[PDB]
């Protein structure tokens, strides 16, 4: 749900109908660059009206980091 729309803007983001999940390292798996993740960030603050540090915008590494950097707003 939460979830599901944080898929979507991965997706929407990458041009992607791959599916996503939890497990998924940005870079190595899903091919997200410096200004892919700066996109996500923006985009998921924008989106659910948050914030996220630089700092724990710095440590994520999987879909499901980017999970429960959202998940704590809610």
Same mark, same amino acid.
């Given at each position: 749900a939460m979830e599901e729309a944080i898929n979507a803007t991965i997706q929407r983001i990458l041009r992607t109908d791959r599916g996503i999940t939890a497990?998924? +390292? /940005? +870079? %190595? %798996? /899903?091919?997200?660059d410096s200004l892919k993740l700066f996109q996500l960030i923006t985009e998921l603050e924008d989106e659910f009206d948050i914030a996220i540090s630089f700092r724990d915008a710095q440590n994520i590494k999987t879909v499901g980091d980017v999970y429960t950097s959202v998940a704590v707003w809610f």
């Amino acid at each position: 749900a939460m979830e599901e729309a944080i898929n979507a803007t991965i997706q929407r983001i990458l041009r992607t109908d791959r599916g996503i999940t939890a497990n998924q +390292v /940005l +870079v %190595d %798996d /899903l091919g997200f660059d410096s200004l892919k993740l700066f996109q996500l960030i923006t985009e998921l603050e924008d989106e659910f009206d948050i914030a996220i540090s630089f700092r724990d915008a710095q440590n994520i590494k999987t879909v499901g980091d980017v999970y429960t950097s959202v998940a704590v707003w809610f």
